[PDB]
A paper describes a structure:
Whereas LptY binds and stabilizes the periplasmic LptD β-taco domain that functions as LPS receptor, LptM intercalates the lateral gate of the β-barrel domain, promoting its opening and access by LPS.
We refer to LptDE bound to both LptM and LptY as the LPS translocon “holo-complex”. Furthermore, we solved the structures of LptDE bound to either LptM, LptY, or both proteins (holo-complex) at resolutions of 2.47, 2.62, and 2.63 Å, respectively. In these complexes, binding of LptM, LptY, or both stabilized the β-taco domain, enabling its structural determination. In both LptDEM and LptDEMY structures, we resolved portions of the LptM lipid tails in positions proximal to the external surface of the LptD lateral gate. Similarly, the holo-complex and the LptDEM complex showed an RMSD lower than 0.1 Å for the membrane-embedded portion of the translocon and an RMSD ranging from 0.1 to 0.8 Å for the β-taco domain. Henceforth we will name these distinct LptD conformations “contracted” state, as observed in the structure of LptDEY, and “extended” state, as observed in LptDEMY and LptDEM structures. Our comparison revealed that the pairing pattern of β1-β26 in the extended conformation (LptDEM and LptDEMY) superimposes well with that observed in the LptD structures of K. pneumoniae and S. flexneri.
Residue numbers in the entry:
A (entry chain B): 19 to 171
B (entry chain D): 20 to 30
C (entry chain A): 25 to 43, 50 to 58, 73 to 76, 79 to 91, 102 to 765, 767 to 784
């Protein structure tokens, strides 16, 4: 085999306590990032805390684009592709900042005679895309602890 | 001739 | 070497420290930021004359010519018969008398001329009886202005302004033109109105030769406490093309209204608008536009207002649609919809959430059902976790009430009949468990690691016959790999399918010695223990299969380097006997300027039959599904040409879907762009084949006057199948 159960946590032990900073703290990306961080056992602190020893995740620009990805033989849309891009950064206190990003792709068929149903399906898809963006940012945290140790060595 | 740009809050 | 560097080689730097003390040097001439040099100077007390090879330089201009004069107290100056060259900025020119006034602010030129072209490279120039460069307003003002390309004047006016910086200014923008099969020759002439720092407008007459009239295009943009937005009102008073195809009608006006807004205010109030409306179904097939497209079967009309805080949100919205096709005139709207969510974590070990909705459904047709629906959804969950795995358990109640109205017409046509009052209550139960195994790679490279991530989920939702509820908002969802783990088969609340199934799936990931994810692959399936039913199960399939492993999906991503990326996914459904849909793409991208992407999209004929309106399986334009190959590229030739292009091809038809080709030549002094597109733009019913529209578009720009500086990324998104970056 060589396979074994994962020995460490998904989040670095130096990031067990951290500050989640956002321009939209009540928004849908912020909620997905709050939810993943708590599910990984992270205890979050408020932005204006006295704890200047703990790292911060600073959420930045979110973009969502919806584009025609396929057409039928009359040139009408067959499929839309939705792309979400999230930019964020991690500050390790008294050390450098590490930029991170997530990118999520989803597609769906259009239907002009179920247009309201398709708009509800688009809201459904966008909610799921924030969970994938939140998972992707948390999977990038071990790389930041590696970049931190490499900047030290 | 004129010239366009990004919007910003006064001042 | 890069174009910004080529242009800077023709632009003076400043050779001295930025800054009073005064120095005079001579045989018995060099004088000192501001410096004067000459063969001869005469000084009086305060003024100087200067003569012979007079040269003056400064923090913003070089001046040269036969004779100089200045007043030393005011720094007022005259240079006759001279030429000038800006410092740290690209402009230069000649004048019969060049004057500095208002303590360096105003530079006046009698019989002047001006260009941003580098020395000897004299492509274009302004000439006037007078020119004034004003450094505080960032403007050149010209009287009896002639605009020359080479030695010949293209244009004249009694007065002109050029903006010569980056500060905004009202007036005409540089025009553009195109030739299209749809309108013949077309011309656009934007006027820009700078209303305030936080809002502006553009008024653009758009001439179309085929129609013999001007469309007026009006854009308004704003920034506010409530958010930022854009409104566009495009209006054509009459249309000689439309008035032949629709000859009996009262008036041939064409119009578009668009409004978009987004904003969050005081961190808690959320505002959104996404509104389009047009005079007729044909609008986006006739008129090329920034917002709609010929690819679109309806215009969307949405408003929402929401209050959101960390543990609660409430949103009121409307959702209306204008549908272009004549094939069905019915369309449902939400008027309004109210959504509410409440959250409470650590309720003992459990986390709690409540979702609530109230919606009123209205139709464009007088004879269609109308309803009010109210929905309430309490959820309780117990998350458990380890280093190496986790398990989540949820329970929900799916309580819904309908009041349905206007049923007499629909109940005359159908044997299954709608009910004026409907309650549906369903318990949902879910269990969702994950593990993570790790392995050291001996084989690929030192320090690499592989992860193996198995998931399994059980879902139970009981059967409720829903055939007495009309379907207002439930579309069948597409089962991608993440979609294997949804609790819903449909997109709304009017169909909830019974569930008795285990989803299983596995992901593997490869991590390098920097702990960056290089690759992943995902595979999974849904195994159904009982048939997933709604009681309105009128969907049509190739097989009578109901239970077992019916749905498969997979997904992969390889980040081959920081320049190369491979993505792809597949959906297979045993009820189609076939691959339902697939897509893949490979991309190389070195820069914004330098990329190539190949992409493929598949959706089977059986998938169209199972999931789209029933006439799509009969209409030759829809019937065959999708099998589309696409190539997109951008590359620079020398440092001055950008070539951009896209080709998209239907592999069943052996016919082109879209083709775009864009060439931009970029000098220091100007740029030119030519863009071609040929697109599918409708169907000919009388001959049973596709219609194509061609467009050739010409854009031209001045350079060196502003920070604006190879056109690649704008061209890549001009076409009906626009570029998305897949690295």
């Amino acid at each position: 085999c060589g396979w074994h159960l994962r020995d460490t946590t998904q989040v670095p032990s130096t990031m067990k306590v951290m500050i989640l900073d956002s321009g939209d703290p009540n928004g849908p990306l912020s909620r997905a990032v709050r939810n993943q961080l708590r599910l990984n056992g992270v205890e979050l602190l408020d932005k204006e805390t006295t704890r200047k020893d703990v790292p911060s995740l600073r959420l930045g620009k979110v973009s969502i684009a919806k584009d025609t990805a396929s057409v039928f033989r009359n040139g009408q849309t067959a499929e839309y592709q939705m792309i979400m891009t999230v930019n964020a950064t991690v500050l390790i206190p008294g050390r450098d900042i590490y930029p991170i990003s997530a990118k999520v792709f989803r597609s769906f068929f259009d239907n002009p005679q179920m247009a309201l149903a398709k708009d509800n399906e688009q809201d459904m898809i966008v909610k799921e895309m924030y969970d994938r963006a939140a998972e992707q940012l948390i999977r990038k945290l071990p790389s930041i602890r590696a970049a931190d140790i490499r900047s030290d060595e | 001739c004129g010239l366009k740009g990004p919007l910003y809050f006064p001042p | 070497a890069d174009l910004a560097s080529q242009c800077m080689l023709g632009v003076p730097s400043y050779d001295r420290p930025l800054v009073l003390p005064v120095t005079i040097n001579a045989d018995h001439v060099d004088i000192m930021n501001s410096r004067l040099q000459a063969d001869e100077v005469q000084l009086h007390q305060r003024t100087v004359d200067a003569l012979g090879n007079v040269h003056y330089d400064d923090n913003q201009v070089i001046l040269k010519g036969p004779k100089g004069w200045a007043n030393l107290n005011t720094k007022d100056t005259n240079v006759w018969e001279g030429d000038y060259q800006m410092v740290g900025r690209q402009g230069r020119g000649k004048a019969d008398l060049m004057k500095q006034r208002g303590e360096n602010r105003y530079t006046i030129l009698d019989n002047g001329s001006f260009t941003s072209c580098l020395p000897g490279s004299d492509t274009w120039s302004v000439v006037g009886s007078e020119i004034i460069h004003d450094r505080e307003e960032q403007v050149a003002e010209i009287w009896n202005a002639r605009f020359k390309v080479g030695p010949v004047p293209i244009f004249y006016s009694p007065y002109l302004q050029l903006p010569v910086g980056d500060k905004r200014r009202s007036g005409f923008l540089i025009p553009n033109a195109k030739y299209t099969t749809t309108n013949y020759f077309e011309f656009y002439l934007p006027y820009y109105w700078n209303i305030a720092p936080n809002m502006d407008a553009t008024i653009t007459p758009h001439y179309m030769h085929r129609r013999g009239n001007i469309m007026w295009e009006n854009e308004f943009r704003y920034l506010s406490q409530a958010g930022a937005g854009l409104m566009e009102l495009d209006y054509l008073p009459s249309d000689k093309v439309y008035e032949d195809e629709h000859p009996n009608d009262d008036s041939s006006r064409r119009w578009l209204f668009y409004w978009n807004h987004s904003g969050v205010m005081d961190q808690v109030w959320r505002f959104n608008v996404d509104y389009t409306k047009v005079s007729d179904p044909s609008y986006f097939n006739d008129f090329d536009n920034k917002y709609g497209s010929s690819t679109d079967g309806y215009a969307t009309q949405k408003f929402s207002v929401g209050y959101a805080v960390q543990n609660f949100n409430a949103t009121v919205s409307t959702k209306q649609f204008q549908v272009f096709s004549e094939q069905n005139t019915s369309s449902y709207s939400a008027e309004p919809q109210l959504d509410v969510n409440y959250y409470q974590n650590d309720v003992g070990p459990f986390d709690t959430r409540i979702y609530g909705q109230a919606v009123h459904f209205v139709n464009t047709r007088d004879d269609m059902p109308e309803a009010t629906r109210v929905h309430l959804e309490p959820t309780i969950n117990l998350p458990l976790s380890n280093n190496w795995g986790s398990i989540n358990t949820e329970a929900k109640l799916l309580a819904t009430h309908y009041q349905q109205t206007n049923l007499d017409w629909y109940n005359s046509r159908n044997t299954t009949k709608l009910d004026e009052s409907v309650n549906r209550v369903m318990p949902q139960f879910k269990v969702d468990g994950k593990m993570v195994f790790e392995r050291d790679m001996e084989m690929l490279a030192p320090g690499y690691t592989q992860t193996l991530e198995p998931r399994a989920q059980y879902l139970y939702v009981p059967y409720r016959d829903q055939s007495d509820i009309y379907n207002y908002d439930s579309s069948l969802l597409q089962s991608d790999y993440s979609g294997l783990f949804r609790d819903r088969t449909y997109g709304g609340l009017d169909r909830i399918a019974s569930a008795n199934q285990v989803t299983t799936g596995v992901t593997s990931r490869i991590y390098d010695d920097a702990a960056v994810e290089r690759f992943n692959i995902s595979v999974g399936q849904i195994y159904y223990f009982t048939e997933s039913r709604t009681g309105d199960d009128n969907i049509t399939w190739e097989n009578d299969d109901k239970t077992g492993s019916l749905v498969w999906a997979g997904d992969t991503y390889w980040r081959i380097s920081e320049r190369w990326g491979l993505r792809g996914g597949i959906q297979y459904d045993t009820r189609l006997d076939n691959v339902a849909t697939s897509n893949s793409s490979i991309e190389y991208r070195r820069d914004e300027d330098r990329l190539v992407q190949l992409n493929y999209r598949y959706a089977s004929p059986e998938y169209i039959q199972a999931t789209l309106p029933k006439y799509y399986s009969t209409a030759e334009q829809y019937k065959n599904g999708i099998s589309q190959v696409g190539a997109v590229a951008s590359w620079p030739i020398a440092d001055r040409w950008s070539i951009v292009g896209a080709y998209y091809y239907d592999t069943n038809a052996n016919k082109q879907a879209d083709s775009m080709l864009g060439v931009q030549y970029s000098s220091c002094c100007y740029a030119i762009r030519v863009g071609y597109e040929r697109k599918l733009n409708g169907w000919d019913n009388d001959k049973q084949h596709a219609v194509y529209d061609n467009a050739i578009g010409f854009n031209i720009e001045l350079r060196g006057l502003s920070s604006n500086y190879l056109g690649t990324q704008e061209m890549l998104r001009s076409n009906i199948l626009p570029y998305q970056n897949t690295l």
